Structure 1
């Protein structure tokens, strides 16, 4: 399965509460932004965080999300 863990789920939604105006619906732009916003120890976790943030951004435009 592809269930994301808590280390990626909670860290991504902190970004939305903190940098929503600068975020977007594009993964490639979001991936570069989070490399200057967060100190990520490994490249794989950086893409994972941005990939779930993009899903949340895509979901916020369709209505209110729980936790943000």
Structure 2
């Protein structure tokens, strides 16, 4: 499985926009661990958790290098003028 279904992407986007300060991209361990938290998000199945975490890391580094539309980063401070 390489193409990721819609559910993965939508939930991953929600997670990033919600928990951004504690998702360091480029690692598959931190993000998996954080997604394990129920205060963060709940995954019924192991494989789904790994899949979601992987997409979350790829989205997070894509964003840290160049933020995207549809994901809110509160960057006004450096673009509010």
What are the Cα deviations for residues 2-55 of structure 1, in whole angstroms up to 9, with x where unaligned?
A: 110011000000011100001111111100110102111101110101100000
User: CA–CA distance in 2 between the matches of 1:14 and 1:40?
Assistant: 14
Q: Does 1:65 align with 2:68?
A: yes
Superposition RMSD in Å: 1.1
How many pairs were matched up? 68
Per the normalisation by structure 2, the TM-score is 0.78
Q: How does 1:1-68 map to 2 (within 5 A)?
A: 2-25=2-25, 26-36=27-37, 37-68=40-71
Structure number, greater radius of gyration: 2
SS state at 1:27 partner: coil
Relative contact order, higher structure (CA 8 A, sep 6+):
1
Gaps of 5+ in 2: 72-81
Moved over 6 A (4+): none
Per the normalisation by structure 1, the TM-score is 0.91
